[PDB]
Amino acid sequence: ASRILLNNGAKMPILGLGTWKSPPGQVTEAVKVAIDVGYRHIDCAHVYQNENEVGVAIQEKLREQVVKREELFIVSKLWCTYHEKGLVKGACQKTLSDLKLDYLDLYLIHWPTGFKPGKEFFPLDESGNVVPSDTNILDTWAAMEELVDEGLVKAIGISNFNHLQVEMILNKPGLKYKPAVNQIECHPYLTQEKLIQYCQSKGIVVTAYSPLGSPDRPWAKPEDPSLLEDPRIKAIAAKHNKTTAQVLIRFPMQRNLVVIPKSVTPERIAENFKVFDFELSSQDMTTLLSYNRNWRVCALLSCTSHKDYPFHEEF
Template identity: 60%
Template sequence: MTTFVELSTKAKMPILGLGTWQSPIGKVRDAMKFAIDIGYRHFDCAYVYQNENEIGNAMEEKIEEGVVTREDLFVVSKLWCTFHEKSLVKEACQNTLAALKLAYLDLYLMHWPMGFKAGEELFPADENGMIIPSDTDFLDTWEAMEELVDAGLVKSIGLSNFSCEQIERLLKKPDLKYKPVNNQIESHPYLPQEELVNYCQSQEISVTAYCPLGAPNWPRGEDFCLLDDPKIKEIADKHSKTSAQVIETFVCVLSPFKVFDFELTKEEMETILSFKRRYRICSLSM
Protein backbone atom coordinates (compact mmCIF):
# COMPACT_ATOMS: atom_id res chain seq x y z
CA MET A 1 0.00 0.00 0.00
CA THR A 2 1.53 3.32 -1.09
CA THR A 3 1.77 6.00 1.58
CA PHE A 4 3.55 8.84 -0.23
CA VAL A 5 4.28 10.29 -3.63
CA GLU A 6 7.83 11.22 -4.52
CA LEU A 7 7.95 14.71 -6.01
CA SER A 8 10.34 15.62 -8.81
CA THR A 9 12.55 17.17 -6.10
CA LYS A 10 12.71 13.71 -4.43
CA ALA A 11 10.72 15.03 -1.46
CA LYS A 12 8.13 12.56 -0.16
CA MET A 13 4.60 13.93 0.14
CA PRO A 14 2.12 11.76 2.09
CA ILE A 15 -0.72 10.79 -0.25
CA LEU A 16 -3.56 11.45 2.18
CA GLY A 17 -3.66 14.95 3.59
CA LEU A 18 -5.99 16.98 5.78
CA GLY A 19 -7.51 19.95 4.01
CA THR A 20 -8.24 22.99 6.18
CA TRP A 21 -10.65 24.89 3.91
CA GLN A 22 -13.92 25.61 5.77
CA SER A 23 -12.23 24.72 9.08
CA PRO A 24 -13.59 27.45 11.37
CA ILE A 25 -11.68 29.43 13.97
CA GLY A 26 -12.30 27.86 17.36
CA LYS A 27 -12.48 24.32 15.94
CA VAL A 28 -9.56 23.90 13.55
CA ARG A 29 -6.97 23.79 16.35
CA ASP A 30 -8.55 20.75 18.00
CA ALA A 31 -9.16 19.13 14.62
CA MET A 32 -5.47 19.53 13.75
CA LYS A 33 -4.31 18.10 17.06
CA PHE A 34 -6.62 15.11 16.69
CA ALA A 35 -5.45 14.57 13.10
CA ILE A 36 -1.81 14.52 14.18
CA ASP A 37 -2.62 12.10 17.00
CA ILE A 38 -4.25 9.60 14.62
CA GLY A 39 -1.44 9.77 12.09
CA TYR A 40 -2.02 12.58 9.59
CA ARG A 41 1.25 14.20 8.49
CA HIS A 42 0.24 16.13 5.34
CA PHE A 43 -1.64 19.38 5.96
CA ASP A 44 -3.03 21.64 3.27
CA CYS A 45 -3.38 25.29 4.26
CA ALA A 46 -3.86 28.64 2.56
CA TYR A 47 -3.76 32.31 3.48
CA VAL A 48 -7.30 32.82 2.16
CA TYR A 49 -8.70 30.22 4.60
CA GLN A 50 -7.93 32.75 7.38
CA ASN A 51 -7.17 30.07 9.97
CA GLU A 52 -3.39 29.56 9.73
CA ASN A 53 -2.73 30.96 13.23
CA GLU A 54 -4.75 28.22 14.92
CA ILE A 55 -3.20 25.59 12.68
CA GLY A 56 0.24 26.86 13.66
CA ASN A 57 -0.67 26.72 17.35
CA ALA A 58 -1.77 23.10 17.01
CA MET A 59 1.39 22.01 15.21
CA GLU A 60 3.56 23.86 17.72
CA GLU A 61 1.82 22.13 20.63
CA LYS A 62 2.25 18.67 19.14
CA ILE A 63 5.90 19.30 18.35
CA GLU A 64 6.51 20.54 21.91
CA GLU A 65 4.72 17.46 23.29
CA GLY A 66 7.11 15.28 21.28
CA VAL A 67 4.28 13.64 19.31
CA VAL A 68 5.92 14.71 16.02
CA THR A 69 8.96 16.61 14.83
CA ARG A 70 8.85 19.35 12.21
CA GLU A 71 10.52 16.96 9.80
CA ASP A 72 7.64 14.50 10.22
CA LEU A 73 5.17 17.02 8.83
CA PHE A 74 4.51 17.99 5.22
CA VAL A 75 2.95 21.44 5.29
CA VAL A 76 1.48 23.11 2.22
CA SER A 77 0.22 26.67 1.89
CA LYS A 78 -0.77 28.93 -0.98
CA LEU A 79 -0.03 32.41 -2.26
CA TRP A 80 -3.30 34.30 -2.47
CA CYS A 81 -4.30 36.22 -5.60
CA THR A 82 -3.90 39.69 -4.06
CA PHE A 83 -0.15 39.05 -3.62
CA HIS A 84 0.79 38.30 -7.24
CA GLU A 85 2.94 41.41 -7.65
CA LYS A 86 6.57 40.32 -7.41
CA SER A 87 7.28 42.78 -4.60
CA LEU A 88 4.54 41.23 -2.42
CA VAL A 89 5.30 37.53 -2.74
CA LYS A 90 8.08 37.18 -0.17
CA GLU A 91 6.22 39.10 2.53
CA ALA A 92 3.08 37.06 1.89
CA CYS A 93 5.05 33.85 2.38
CA GLN A 94 6.75 35.19 5.51
CA ASN A 95 3.37 36.14 6.99
CA THR A 96 2.09 32.61 6.38
CA LEU A 97 5.22 31.16 7.98
CA ALA A 98 4.77 33.42 11.02
CA ALA A 99 1.13 32.37 11.37
CA LEU A 100 2.01 28.68 11.04
CA LYS A 101 5.01 29.13 13.35
CA LEU A 102 7.33 27.47 10.86
CA ALA A 103 10.76 28.27 9.46
CA TYR A 104 9.89 26.82 6.06
CA LEU A 105 7.06 25.31 4.02
CA ASP A 106 7.41 21.94 2.34
CA LEU A 107 5.34 23.15 -0.61
CA TYR A 108 4.06 26.60 -1.60
CA LEU A 109 1.47 26.85 -4.34
CA MET A 110 0.19 29.71 -6.47
CA HIS A 111 -3.47 29.46 -5.46
CA TRP A 112 -4.93 30.58 -8.82
CA PRO A 113 -3.31 31.60 -12.12
CA MET A 114 -4.94 35.04 -12.05
CA GLY A 115 -4.02 37.88 -9.73
CA PHE A 116 -6.40 40.30 -8.01
CA LYS A 117 -5.88 43.96 -7.17
CA ALA A 118 -3.50 44.23 -4.21
CA GLY A 119 -4.95 45.40 -0.91
CA GLU A 120 -6.72 44.32 2.26
CA GLU A 121 -9.76 42.79 0.54
CA LEU A 122 -9.47 39.10 -0.33
CA PHE A 123 -11.91 39.52 -3.23
CA PRO A 124 -11.63 43.14 -4.43
CA ALA A 125 -14.68 43.85 -6.55
CA ASP A 126 -15.97 46.73 -8.67
CA GLU A 127 -19.45 48.29 -8.52
CA ASN A 128 -20.80 45.41 -10.62
CA GLY A 129 -19.50 42.77 -8.25
CA MET A 130 -16.74 41.66 -10.61
CA ILE A 131 -13.22 40.94 -9.37
CA ILE A 132 -10.70 43.71 -10.04
CA PRO A 133 -7.71 41.99 -11.66
CA SER A 134 -4.01 42.57 -11.14
CA ASP A 135 -1.81 43.57 -14.07
CA THR A 136 0.84 41.03 -13.01
CA ASP A 137 1.39 38.03 -15.27
CA PHE A 138 1.67 34.72 -13.39
CA LEU A 139 5.05 34.15 -15.08
CA ASP A 140 6.39 37.14 -13.14
CA THR A 141 4.78 35.87 -9.93
CA TRP A 142 6.53 32.54 -10.50
CA GLU A 143 9.93 34.26 -10.60
CA ALA A 144 9.27 35.65 -7.13
CA MET A 145 8.23 32.21 -5.92
CA GLU A 146 11.48 30.76 -7.27
CA GLU A 147 13.32 33.27 -5.08
CA LEU A 148 11.56 31.77 -2.04
CA VAL A 149 13.24 28.44 -2.76
CA ASP A 150 16.64 30.11 -3.03
CA ALA A 151 15.99 31.92 0.27
CA GLY A 152 15.16 28.65 2.04
CA LEU A 153 11.64 29.75 2.91
CA VAL A 154 10.06 26.91 0.92
CA LYS A 155 11.34 23.50 -0.14
CA SER A 156 9.27 23.25 -3.32
CA ILE A 157 6.86 25.36 -5.33
CA GLY A 158 3.82 24.42 -7.34
CA LEU A 159 0.48 25.44 -8.74
CA SER A 160 -3.21 25.22 -7.97
CA ASN A 161 -6.15 25.44 -10.36
CA PHE A 162 -3.90 25.68 -13.43
CA SER A 163 -5.04 24.32 -16.80
CA CYS A 164 -2.94 22.37 -19.31
CA GLU A 165 -2.46 25.52 -21.39
CA GLN A 166 -1.34 27.61 -18.43
CA ILE A 167 1.09 24.96 -17.23
CA GLU A 168 2.54 24.61 -20.72
CA ARG A 169 3.04 28.37 -20.91
CA LEU A 170 4.97 28.26 -17.62
CA LEU A 171 7.08 25.28 -18.68
CA LYS A 172 8.05 27.12 -21.89
CA LYS A 173 9.28 30.14 -19.95
CA PRO A 174 12.84 30.67 -21.30
CA ASP A 175 14.50 31.37 -17.95
CA LEU A 176 12.51 28.88 -15.86
CA LYS A 177 14.61 27.99 -12.83
CA TYR A 178 12.33 25.60 -10.94
CA LYS A 179 9.58 23.49 -12.47
CA PRO A 180 6.33 23.20 -10.55
CA VAL A 181 6.26 19.93 -8.61
CA ASN A 182 2.53 19.82 -7.99
CA ASN A 183 -0.81 21.04 -9.33
CA GLN A 184 -3.66 21.03 -6.84
CA ILE A 185 -7.02 20.80 -8.59
CA GLU A 186 -10.65 20.03 -7.88
CA SER A 187 -11.16 16.38 -8.74
CA HIS A 188 -13.96 13.98 -7.84
CA PRO A 189 -16.33 11.61 -9.70
CA TYR A 190 -18.43 14.54 -10.98
CA LEU A 191 -15.29 16.37 -12.19
CA PRO A 192 -12.45 13.84 -12.67
CA GLN A 193 -10.37 16.02 -15.03
CA GLU A 194 -8.60 13.01 -16.56
CA GLU A 195 -7.00 15.05 -19.35
CA LEU A 196 -5.44 17.52 -16.93
CA VAL A 197 -4.26 14.73 -14.60
CA ASN A 198 -2.67 12.86 -17.51
CA TYR A 199 -0.95 16.00 -18.78
CA CYS A 200 0.52 16.77 -15.36
CA GLN A 201 1.82 13.22 -15.04
CA SER A 202 3.44 13.47 -18.47
CA GLN A 203 5.34 16.53 -17.22
CA GLU A 204 6.38 14.91 -13.91
CA ILE A 205 4.02 17.20 -12.00
CA SER A 206 2.18 15.43 -9.19
CA VAL A 207 -1.52 16.08 -8.73
CA THR A 208 -3.35 16.75 -5.48
CA ALA A 209 -7.14 16.47 -5.59
CA TYR A 210 -9.20 18.83 -3.48
CA CYS A 211 -12.91 18.38 -2.69
CA PRO A 212 -12.57 14.64 -3.50
CA LEU A 213 -15.83 13.96 -1.60
CA GLY A 214 -17.59 16.86 -3.28
CA ALA A 215 -17.44 19.24 -0.27
CA PRO A 216 -20.67 17.91 1.33
CA ASN A 217 -21.15 21.02 3.51
CA TRP A 218 -20.66 23.56 0.72
CA PRO A 219 -23.90 25.27 -0.38
CA ARG A 220 -24.93 24.47 -3.95
CA GLY A 221 -27.80 25.39 -6.21
CA GLU A 222 -28.78 21.86 -7.21
CA ASP A 223 -29.00 18.39 -5.78
CA PHE A 224 -25.37 17.41 -5.43
CA CYS A 225 -24.13 14.85 -2.94
CA LEU A 226 -21.51 12.38 -4.05
CA LEU A 227 -21.81 10.36 -0.86
CA ASP A 228 -25.46 9.64 -1.65
CA ASP A 229 -24.98 8.80 -5.31
CA PRO A 230 -26.80 5.45 -5.79
CA LYS A 231 -24.16 4.00 -8.15
CA ILE A 232 -21.35 4.82 -5.71
CA LYS A 233 -23.34 3.37 -2.81
CA GLU A 234 -23.91 0.20 -4.86
CA ILE A 235 -20.16 -0.18 -5.44
CA ALA A 236 -19.48 0.53 -1.76
CA ASP A 237 -21.94 -2.14 -0.63
CA LYS A 238 -20.32 -4.64 -2.99
CA HIS A 239 -16.93 -4.09 -1.33
CA SER A 240 -18.37 -3.66 2.19
CA LYS A 241 -16.88 -0.16 2.25
CA THR A 242 -18.22 3.35 2.69
CA SER A 243 -19.03 5.68 -0.19
CA ALA A 244 -16.19 7.92 0.99
CA GLN A 245 -13.68 5.05 0.71
CA VAL A 246 -14.86 4.27 -2.82
CA ILE A 247 -14.54 7.92 -3.87
CA GLU A 248 -11.09 8.33 -2.31
CA THR A 249 -9.96 5.13 -4.03
CA PHE A 250 -11.30 6.38 -7.36
CA VAL A 251 -9.43 9.70 -7.02
CA CYS A 252 -6.21 7.96 -5.97
CA VAL A 253 -6.40 5.54 -8.91
CA LEU A 254 -6.55 8.54 -11.23
CA SER A 255 -3.30 9.75 -9.69
CA PRO A 256 -2.40 6.66 -9.70
CA PHE A 257 -1.86 5.25 -6.21
CA LYS A 258 -3.32 2.62 -3.94
CA VAL A 259 -4.10 3.67 -0.39
CA PHE A 260 -6.77 1.23 0.77
CA ASP A 261 -7.00 -2.54 1.09
CA PHE A 262 -9.32 -2.95 -1.90
CA GLU A 263 -9.36 -2.07 -5.57
CA LEU A 264 -12.05 -0.90 -7.94
CA THR A 265 -12.57 -3.08 -10.99
CA LYS A 266 -12.16 -1.67 -14.47
CA GLU A 267 -15.94 -1.79 -14.87
CA GLU A 268 -16.46 0.11 -11.61
CA MET A 269 -13.98 2.79 -12.68
CA GLU A 270 -15.79 3.12 -16.02
CA THR A 271 -19.13 3.41 -14.21
CA ILE A 272 -17.88 6.31 -12.11
CA LEU A 273 -16.19 7.98 -15.10
CA SER A 274 -19.48 7.73 -17.01
CA PHE A 275 -21.25 10.19 -14.69
CA LYS A 276 -20.26 13.07 -17.01
CA ARG A 277 -21.80 15.71 -14.75
CA ARG A 278 -18.71 17.92 -14.81
CA TYR A 279 -19.94 19.82 -11.77
CA ARG A 280 -17.41 22.35 -10.47
CA ILE A 281 -17.62 23.41 -6.83
CA CYS A 282 -14.89 26.08 -6.85
CA SER A 283 -15.73 28.17 -9.89
CA LEU A 284 -14.88 31.73 -8.69
CA SER A 285 -17.92 33.05 -10.55
CA MET A 286 -17.01 36.65 -9.64
Protein backbone atom coordinates in the same frame (compact mmCIF):
# COMPACT_ATOMS: atom_id res chain seq x y z
CA ALA B 1 2.68 3.27 -0.88
CA SER B 2 1.87 6.24 1.25
CA ARG B 3 4.01 8.92 -0.47
CA ILE B 4 4.77 10.05 -4.05
CA LEU B 5 8.09 11.41 -5.29
CA LEU B 6 8.18 15.08 -6.33
CA ASN B 7 10.60 16.64 -8.78
CA ASN B 8 12.59 18.17 -5.90
CA GLY B 9 13.47 14.72 -4.48
CA ALA B 10 11.02 14.96 -1.58
CA LYS B 11 8.18 12.56 -0.86
CA MET B 12 4.62 13.86 -0.49
CA PRO B 13 1.96 11.95 1.46
CA ILE B 14 -0.83 10.97 -0.93
CA LEU B 15 -3.50 11.52 1.71
CA GLY B 16 -3.73 14.92 3.43
CA LEU B 17 -6.21 16.86 5.53
CA GLY B 18 -8.08 19.79 3.96
CA THR B 19 -8.74 22.92 5.98
CA TRP B 20 -10.97 25.19 3.83
CA LYS B 21 -14.04 26.14 5.92
CA SER B 22 -12.57 24.49 9.02
CA PRO B 23 -13.55 27.14 11.59
CA PRO B 24 -10.73 28.44 13.77
CA GLY B 25 -12.86 27.43 16.77
CA GLN B 26 -12.67 23.80 15.59
CA VAL B 27 -9.58 23.32 13.38
CA THR B 28 -6.99 22.99 16.14
CA GLU B 29 -8.74 19.90 17.45
CA ALA B 30 -9.13 18.59 13.91
CA VAL B 31 -5.47 18.79 13.16
CA LYS B 32 -4.52 17.27 16.52
CA VAL B 33 -6.75 14.25 15.90
CA ALA B 34 -5.58 13.98 12.25
CA ILE B 35 -1.96 13.81 13.40
CA ASP B 36 -2.81 11.22 16.10
CA VAL B 37 -4.49 8.92 13.56
CA GLY B 38 -1.73 9.17 10.96
CA TYR B 39 -2.09 12.19 8.76
CA ARG B 40 1.21 13.82 7.91
CA HIS B 41 0.10 16.19 5.13
CA ILE B 42 -2.03 19.24 5.89
CA ASP B 43 -3.35 21.51 3.10
CA CYS B 44 -3.60 25.14 4.19
CA ALA B 45 -4.10 28.59 2.77
CA HIS B 46 -3.83 32.20 3.98
CA VAL B 47 -7.29 32.89 2.59
CA TYR B 48 -8.79 30.15 4.81
CA GLN B 49 -8.19 32.50 7.80
CA ASN B 50 -7.30 29.63 10.16
CA GLU B 51 -3.55 29.16 9.69
CA ASN B 52 -2.84 30.40 13.20
CA GLU B 53 -5.08 27.67 14.66
CA VAL B 54 -3.56 25.03 12.37
CA GLY B 55 -0.18 26.18 13.59
CA VAL B 56 -1.29 25.82 17.24
CA ALA B 57 -2.13 22.17 16.61
CA ILE B 58 1.15 21.41 14.89
CA GLN B 59 3.20 23.14 17.54
CA GLU B 60 1.49 21.20 20.24
CA LYS B 61 1.97 17.75 18.70
CA LEU B 62 5.60 18.68 18.11
CA ARG B 63 5.77 19.59 21.82
CA GLU B 64 4.08 16.35 22.80
CA GLN B 65 6.75 14.40 20.84
CA VAL B 66 4.06 12.78 18.67
CA VAL B 67 5.69 13.73 15.35
CA LYS B 68 8.88 15.36 14.10
CA ARG B 69 8.84 18.39 11.75
CA GLU B 70 10.61 16.35 9.04
CA GLU B 71 7.77 13.85 9.05
CA LEU B 72 5.16 16.49 8.30
CA PHE B 73 4.29 17.82 4.82
CA ILE B 74 2.76 21.28 5.17
CA VAL B 75 1.25 23.00 2.13
CA SER B 76 0.05 26.54 1.86
CA LYS B 77 -0.94 28.89 -0.99
CA LEU B 78 -0.23 32.43 -2.17
CA TRP B 79 -3.55 34.34 -2.33
CA CYS B 80 -4.66 36.25 -5.46
CA THR B 81 -4.12 39.72 -3.96
CA TYR B 82 -0.41 39.02 -3.48
CA HIS B 83 0.71 38.18 -7.06
CA GLU B 84 2.92 41.28 -7.43
CA LYS B 85 6.61 40.26 -7.20
CA GLY B 86 7.11 42.74 -4.32
CA LEU B 87 4.36 41.12 -2.26
CA VAL B 88 5.12 37.41 -2.56
CA LYS B 89 7.78 37.03 0.12
CA GLY B 90 5.78 38.94 2.75
CA ALA B 91 2.74 36.75 1.96
CA CYS B 92 4.77 33.59 2.44
CA GLN B 93 6.32 34.89 5.64
CA LYS B 94 2.91 35.75 7.07
CA THR B 95 1.84 32.16 6.42
CA LEU B 96 5.04 30.84 8.01
CA SER B 97 4.51 33.11 11.05
CA ASP B 98 0.89 32.06 11.47
CA LEU B 99 1.73 28.38 11.10
CA LYS B 100 4.71 28.82 13.49
CA LEU B 101 6.97 27.17 10.91
CA ASP B 102 10.38 27.98 9.46
CA TYR B 103 9.65 26.39 6.07
CA LEU B 104 6.77 25.06 4.01
CA ASP B 105 7.06 21.71 2.21
CA LEU B 106 5.06 23.09 -0.74
CA TYR B 107 3.81 26.56 -1.62
CA LEU B 108 1.29 26.96 -4.41
CA ILE B 109 0.01 29.87 -6.50
CA HIS B 110 -3.58 29.46 -5.33
CA TRP B 111 -5.24 30.68 -8.56
CA PRO B 112 -3.70 31.94 -11.84
CA THR B 113 -5.72 35.16 -11.45
CA GLY B 114 -4.14 38.12 -9.74
CA PHE B 115 -6.46 40.50 -7.88
CA LYS B 116 -6.03 44.13 -6.91
CA PRO B 117 -3.83 44.36 -3.85
CA GLY B 118 -5.51 45.46 -0.61
CA LYS B 119 -7.10 44.14 2.57
CA GLU B 120 -10.13 42.59 0.78
CA PHE B 121 -9.65 39.01 -0.43
CA PHE B 122 -12.14 39.38 -3.27
CA PRO B 123 -12.14 43.03 -4.31
CA LEU B 124 -15.17 43.70 -6.49
CA ASP B 125 -16.19 46.76 -8.41
CA GLU B 126 -19.59 48.35 -7.77
CA SER B 127 -21.09 45.93 -10.28
CA GLY B 128 -19.77 42.66 -8.81
CA ASN B 129 -16.84 41.98 -11.19
CA VAL B 130 -13.48 41.05 -9.56
CA VAL B 131 -10.90 43.84 -9.81
CA PRO B 132 -7.80 42.30 -11.38
CA SER B 133 -4.19 43.23 -10.82
CA ASP B 134 -1.66 43.91 -13.59
CA THR B 135 0.26 40.77 -12.83
CA ASN B 136 1.07 37.76 -15.01
CA ILE B 137 1.76 34.11 -14.35
CA LEU B 138 5.45 34.22 -15.33
CA ASP B 139 6.51 37.07 -13.05
CA THR B 140 4.55 35.55 -10.15
CA TRP B 141 6.28 32.22 -10.84
CA ALA B 142 9.71 33.92 -10.78
CA ALA B 143 8.83 35.31 -7.35
CA MET B 144 7.85 31.84 -6.13
CA GLU B 145 11.23 30.54 -7.36
CA GLU B 146 12.95 33.06 -5.11
CA LEU B 147 11.21 31.49 -2.08
CA VAL B 148 12.95 28.20 -2.83
CA ASP B 149 16.31 29.86 -3.28
CA GLU B 150 15.93 31.61 0.11
CA GLY B 151 14.96 28.42 1.94
CA LEU B 152 11.44 29.49 2.88
CA VAL B 153 9.84 26.66 0.90
CA LYS B 154 11.10 23.28 -0.28
CA ALA B 155 8.90 23.03 -3.38
CA ILE B 156 6.62 25.30 -5.40
CA GLY B 157 3.62 24.50 -7.51
CA ILE B 158 0.36 25.84 -8.89
CA SER B 159 -3.37 25.35 -8.40
CA ASN B 160 -6.33 25.72 -10.77
CA PHE B 161 -3.99 26.17 -13.76
CA ASN B 162 -5.22 24.89 -17.15
CA HIS B 163 -2.78 23.02 -19.35
CA LEU B 164 -1.89 26.10 -21.43
CA GLN B 165 -1.13 28.03 -18.20
CA VAL B 166 1.04 25.17 -16.99
CA GLU B 167 2.77 25.13 -20.39
CA MET B 168 3.52 28.85 -20.02
CA ILE B 169 5.58 28.21 -16.94
CA LEU B 170 7.22 25.12 -18.41
CA ASN B 171 8.31 27.05 -21.48
CA LYS B 172 9.42 30.09 -19.54
CA PRO B 173 12.84 31.41 -20.60
CA GLY B 174 15.30 30.96 -17.74
CA LEU B 175 12.95 28.71 -15.76
CA LYS B 176 14.62 27.77 -12.47
CA TYR B 177 12.19 25.29 -10.92
CA LYS B 178 9.44 23.33 -12.66
CA PRO B 179 6.15 23.24 -10.76
CA ALA B 180 6.11 20.19 -8.55
CA VAL B 181 2.32 20.01 -8.16
CA ASN B 182 -0.90 21.24 -9.80
CA GLN B 183 -3.72 21.11 -7.27
CA ILE B 184 -7.07 20.91 -9.06
CA GLU B 185 -10.66 20.00 -8.36
CA CYS B 186 -11.19 16.32 -9.11
CA HIS B 187 -13.97 13.81 -8.25
CA PRO B 188 -16.36 11.45 -10.13
CA TYR B 189 -18.34 14.45 -11.50
CA LEU B 190 -15.18 16.25 -12.69
CA THR B 191 -12.71 13.54 -13.58
CA GLN B 192 -10.07 15.73 -15.29
CA GLU B 193 -8.80 13.02 -17.66
CA LYS B 194 -7.03 15.37 -20.08
CA LEU B 195 -5.45 17.69 -17.55
CA ILE B 196 -4.25 14.74 -15.40
CA GLN B 197 -2.76 13.10 -18.47
CA TYR B 198 -1.04 16.33 -19.38
CA CYS B 199 0.35 16.97 -15.90
CA GLN B 200 1.51 13.38 -15.32
CA SER B 201 3.19 13.39 -18.77
CA LYS B 202 5.22 16.46 -17.60
CA GLY B 203 6.23 14.91 -14.25
CA ILE B 204 3.92 17.22 -12.32
CA VAL B 205 2.03 15.52 -9.46
CA VAL B 206 -1.68 16.20 -9.31
CA THR B 207 -3.54 16.83 -6.04
CA ALA B 208 -7.31 16.31 -6.14
CA TYR B 209 -9.33 18.81 -4.08
CA SER B 210 -12.97 18.65 -3.07
CA PRO B 211 -12.91 14.87 -3.53
CA LEU B 212 -16.20 14.50 -1.61
CA GLY B 213 -17.88 17.22 -3.69
CA SER B 214 -17.56 19.87 -0.94
CA PRO B 215 -21.08 19.58 0.47
CA ASP B 216 -20.24 22.52 2.78
CA ARG B 217 -19.34 24.89 -0.06
CA PRO B 218 -21.05 28.22 0.72
CA TRP B 219 -22.83 28.56 -2.66
CA ALA B 220 -24.42 25.12 -2.73
CA LYS B 221 -27.90 24.85 -4.29
CA PRO B 222 -30.34 22.06 -3.53
CA GLU B 223 -30.58 21.13 -7.20
CA ASP B 224 -26.84 20.44 -7.34
CA PRO B 225 -25.48 16.94 -7.76
CA SER B 226 -24.35 15.38 -4.49
CA LEU B 227 -21.54 12.83 -4.54
CA LEU B 228 -21.84 11.60 -0.98
CA GLU B 229 -25.59 10.98 -1.51
CA ASP B 230 -25.22 9.38 -4.96
CA PRO B 231 -26.88 5.93 -4.70
CA ARG B 232 -24.55 4.49 -7.39
CA ILE B 233 -21.51 5.35 -5.33
CA LYS B 234 -23.21 4.14 -2.16
CA ALA B 235 -23.70 0.79 -3.84
CA ILE B 236 -19.97 0.50 -4.67
CA ALA B 237 -19.22 1.44 -1.05
CA ALA B 238 -21.57 -1.20 0.38
CA LYS B 239 -19.98 -3.84 -1.88
CA HIS B 240 -16.66 -3.14 -0.15
CA ASN B 241 -18.16 -2.60 3.35
CA LYS B 242 -16.65 0.89 3.24
CA THR B 243 -18.34 4.31 3.40
CA THR B 244 -19.09 6.48 0.34
CA ALA B 245 -16.42 8.92 1.59
CA GLN B 246 -13.86 6.14 1.71
CA VAL B 247 -14.60 5.11 -1.85
CA LEU B 248 -14.37 8.78 -2.94
CA ILE B 249 -10.91 9.11 -1.27
CA ARG B 250 -9.61 5.76 -2.58
CA PHE B 251 -10.68 6.62 -6.14
CA PRO B 252 -8.05 9.36 -6.80
CA MET B 253 -5.38 7.37 -4.94
CA GLN B 254 -5.74 4.65 -7.59
CA ARG B 255 -5.14 7.24 -10.31
CA ASN B 256 -1.71 8.15 -8.80
CA LEU B 257 -3.17 11.37 -7.40
CA VAL B 258 -2.73 13.03 -4.00
CA VAL B 259 -6.10 13.69 -2.28
CA ILE B 260 -6.98 16.10 0.54
CA PRO B 261 -10.42 15.47 2.03
CA LYS B 262 -11.52 18.00 4.65
CA SER B 263 -13.25 17.29 7.94
CA VAL B 264 -13.39 18.85 11.42
CA THR B 265 -15.40 15.95 12.81
CA PRO B 266 -13.06 13.60 14.73
CA GLU B 267 -15.03 10.46 13.72
CA ARG B 268 -14.80 11.35 10.04
CA ILE B 269 -11.13 12.42 10.21
CA ALA B 270 -10.34 8.91 11.45
CA GLU B 271 -12.79 7.27 8.93
CA ASN B 272 -11.28 9.10 5.98
CA PHE B 273 -7.75 7.86 6.66
CA LYS B 274 -8.80 4.20 6.68
CA VAL B 275 -8.42 3.82 2.93
CA PHE B 276 -5.21 1.80 2.71
CA ASP B 277 -6.79 -1.59 3.41
CA PHE B 278 -8.97 -2.08 0.32
CA GLU B 279 -8.84 -1.74 -3.45
CA LEU B 280 -11.43 -0.54 -5.95
CA SER B 281 -11.76 -3.04 -8.84
CA SER B 282 -11.11 -2.20 -12.47
CA GLN B 283 -14.86 -2.17 -12.92
CA ASP B 284 -15.35 0.17 -9.95
CA MET B 285 -12.78 2.60 -11.39
CA THR B 286 -14.36 2.52 -14.84
CA THR B 287 -17.80 3.01 -13.26
CA LEU B 288 -16.69 6.01 -11.21
CA LEU B 289 -14.91 7.64 -14.17
CA SER B 290 -18.12 7.20 -16.18
CA TYR B 291 -19.95 9.63 -13.85
CA ASN B 292 -18.09 12.66 -15.18
CA ARG B 293 -20.26 15.65 -15.98
CA ASN B 294 -17.68 18.44 -15.90
CA TRP B 295 -19.37 19.84 -12.76
CA ARG B 296 -17.29 22.25 -10.65
CA VAL B 297 -17.54 23.19 -6.97
CA CYS B 298 -15.00 25.95 -7.49
CA ALA B 299 -15.56 28.39 -10.32
CA LEU B 300 -16.54 31.95 -9.40
CA LEU B 301 -18.79 33.72 -11.87
CA SER B 302 -17.20 36.96 -10.62
CA CYS B 303 -13.84 36.10 -12.19
CA THR B 304 -15.00 34.89 -15.60
CA SER B 305 -13.77 38.03 -17.45
CA HIS B 306 -10.32 37.97 -15.81
CA LYS B 307 -7.63 37.63 -18.48
CA ASP B 308 -6.29 34.59 -16.65
CA TYR B 309 -9.59 32.86 -15.81
CA PRO B 310 -8.63 29.21 -16.12
CA PHE B 311 -11.81 27.45 -17.15
CA HIS B 312 -12.62 28.89 -20.56
CA GLU B 313 -10.14 26.33 -22.01
CA GLU B 314 -11.33 22.75 -22.45
CA PHE B 315 -8.55 21.67 -20.08
